[PDB]
Paper text:
Here, we show that Pch2/[name] comprises a new family of [name]+ [name] protein remodelers, with a substrate-recognition domain similar to the NSF/p97/PEX1 remodeler family and a physical mechanism closely related to the bacterial ClpX unfoldase. Pch2/[name] proteins are members of the functionally diverse [name]+ [name] family. These proteins share a common architecture, with a family-specific N-terminal domain (NTD) responsible for localization or substrate recognition, and one or two [name]+ [name] modules that typically assemble into a hexameric ring. We show that [name] converts closed, active [name] to its inactive open conformer, and that p31(comet) functions as an adapter to recognize closed [name] and deliver it to [name]. Thus, [name] regulates the SAC through [name] conformational conversion and safety belt disengagement, and a similar mechanism for HORMAD complex disassembly likely underlies the enzyme's regulatory functions in meiosis.
Numbering used by the authors:
A (entry chain B): 8 to 83, 88 to 108, 122 to 258, 274 to 421
B (entry chain C): 9 to 82, 89 to 108, 122 to 222, 226 to 255, 274 to 422
Write the structure that this text describes.
């Protein structure tokens, strides 16, 4: 496939100066890792029969991803060394000032891979926003070609729009790391803390955006602006906000992301200002299963769910495309997903800890796990 | 299927010698299990038979299981059986910091009485959050906020439940956590009135304590009900991210202030109907308020014989407290809101504008029966 990217996280103790010098060894790693890899699914180690274990001394985690393939697809390759980016995440943490995030940070790193959708939504947003960023970096005339530098995600509260914005900025900061030396993200109104004072109205919306502006005045640095619960905000201040929004988007090295927890009453002013408006719905039956399966598999990783009676093949597998014979356990779990139609994405993430409390035993058997999960679902719906 | 055991040991005896006699403890707990109450303490004195040497070591033992009801009267793991040693004097103010398990919190869990099996549900759920956290479950796959909000009227002993919960967790997670510490903020509603800069400071000290991975950190914020609030919520997040911490919150409002915290909470549990002991607390609080005002004045009866706090459910009770508890039983149906409005009706019945303690009891009792009817 023509354009595929690779993100590689090195150690802090690994000197960045030597990276370009040992760049050849990284490319060998990527060739070996691609022999068995899933799209956008991170590999943390090169195991036996997959290549020299000395390749493990190079990286902490690598991701190989493309927008040409489905979100989970396995590869079957030609990767230009310009699309492979090496990075180290900052652990500095969020700062009070409206929270400032240093990108890429430790907190955002595992978001993207764990976001589950059935509509190829992740690929669509990723590729489109990358195009907006790529164009903007190349200083496109806004008059000739219309680039708003704003993106809007809408849907119910449980769909994880914020997580999309976090993870999206995480990837873009790495993707564009050759173009930008430093990358920051400013998050506003998380959650609805800003809105009440904003409803009361104040002058400091200007003051807040003026600081973003200074950070935007800094070139070779891209800034991300996330705005949560937009309609909780949007009244003298909403004009200042929109005016301040307009000032910010004019910069080439800036990108603003909005999320609206309300559906079907979108503010006309924001839709008009958006490059793209994406609706994120509550997960479908296939997506619900995927989340439930991921929860169980994670519960098994930490040793919460252990069962030696049933083997890996018999364990619930990926149910994608109905291309494999659905195991009864795979089927029973799917039946649970059918019972969990009302539950949101966040609610499904909440389910495991409720299941854990119900279980008497310190460790849950797989057959009982299915039974407990079903009970929690029913209890959560009531 | 799931049973734990906790054992308090005298400050004298070392921790190794107890480990040597550990096997004897297992055989002892099984024997003590035969005749026992769930989640109720068994004293060393209770059984003189067996070893005086083994009984010299421990002060009391508590056997608890979440599958059984609270007081029911009816299978051992060395890990499931824990061994704790009380911190004699750990309350220091700055907000307060507690070293767990402490002596003060040690007897409160057994004195909490709910009609709704509330203790077991909360115990089980918070334990699940504690275990999941300790195993470092990925947040992005399985969402664990490690923040818990408990809501109910001022008489239902919410903050005590949090204290007793953190006490038992430090003992249950004894093997995983070497040290356990709890910070209690805003008890009660004191920090907002104070004018801050201190909230950033005290939370920074928690961060320092929470830096130790072996340490277990509890943060209890009670009476939760613009710049100071944001700063408080931000600090909550930085702690919330840590794997070794747990945030316990109590609110007097059932549902008025939801947006900020409810979303952050793993679970929001309501206490439910007030128990007999809860309604007693609300009735006593009203009478003392009427006394402070000057509505209820009695110079014949001394302060010792006035209604007192029932800290121990089986301790001796004064004649007046025994009466007020009876009246609290009389009002089984009334909600917390109804009981808090009774004093107005009580004062209405009194012709004297000034009320003695015996007449205060009679008028409260009448007011209770009239509001039940109507
Ligand atoms: N599609 C999904 N896949 C995996 N987890 C999800 C999904 N949707 C929601 N979640 C979980 O629910 C939470 C919702 O996060 P957030 O982005 O704040 O939701 P929203 O932006 O819709 O309010 C996330 O932390 C995530 O763990």
């Amino acid at each position: 496939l023509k354009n595929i990217h690779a993100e590689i996280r090195i150690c802090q103790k690994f000197p960045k100066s030597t990276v370009q010098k040992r760049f050849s060894e990284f490319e060998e790693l990527i060739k070996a890792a691609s022999k068995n890899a899933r799209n956008w699914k991170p590999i943390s180690s090169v195991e036996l029969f997959q290549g020299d274990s000395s390749l493990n001394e190079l990286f902490e985690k690598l991701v190989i991803g493309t927008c040409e393939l489905r979100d989970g697809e396995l590869f079957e390759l030609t990767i230009n060394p310009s699309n492979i980016h090496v990075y180290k995440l900052h652990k500095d943490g969020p700062l009070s000032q409206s929270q400032l995030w240093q990108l890429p940070c430790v907190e955002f790193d595992s978001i993207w891979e764990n976001l589950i959708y059935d509509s190829n939504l992740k690929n669509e947003v990723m590729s489109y926003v990358a195009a907006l960023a790529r164009l903007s970096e190349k200083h496109v005339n806004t008059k000739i070609i219309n680039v708003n530098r704003l993106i809007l995600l809408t849907g119910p509260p449980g769909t994880g729009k914020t997580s999309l914005c976090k993870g999206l900025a995480q990837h873009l900061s790495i993707r564009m790391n050759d173009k930008y030396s430093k990358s920051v993200m400013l998050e506003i109104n998380s959650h609805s803390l800003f809105s009440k004072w904003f409803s009361e109205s104040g002058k400091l919306v200007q003051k807040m955006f003026d600081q973003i502006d200074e950070l935007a005045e800094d070139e070779k640095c891209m800034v991300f602006v996330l705005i949560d619960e937009v309609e909780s905000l949007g009244i003298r201040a909403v004009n200042a906000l929109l005016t301040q929004i307009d000032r910010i988007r004019r910069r080439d090295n800036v990108l603003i992301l909005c999320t609206s927890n309300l559906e079907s009453t979108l503010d006309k002013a924001l839709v008009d200002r958006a490059d793209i408006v994406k609706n994120v719905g509550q997960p479908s039956d296939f997506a619900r299963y995927s989340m439930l399966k991921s929860s169980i598999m994670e519960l098994a990783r930490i040793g919460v769910v252990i069962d030696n009676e049933v083997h890996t093949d018999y364990w619930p597998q990926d149910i994608c495309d109905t291309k494999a014979p659905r195991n009864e356990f795979t089927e029973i779990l799917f039946k649970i997903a059918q019972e969990a139609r009302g539950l949101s994405g966040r609610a499904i993430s909440m389910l495991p800890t409720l299941v854990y409390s119900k279980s008497p035993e310190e460790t849950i058997t797989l057959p009982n796990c299915m039974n407990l999960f079903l009970e929690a679902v029913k209890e959560r719906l009531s």
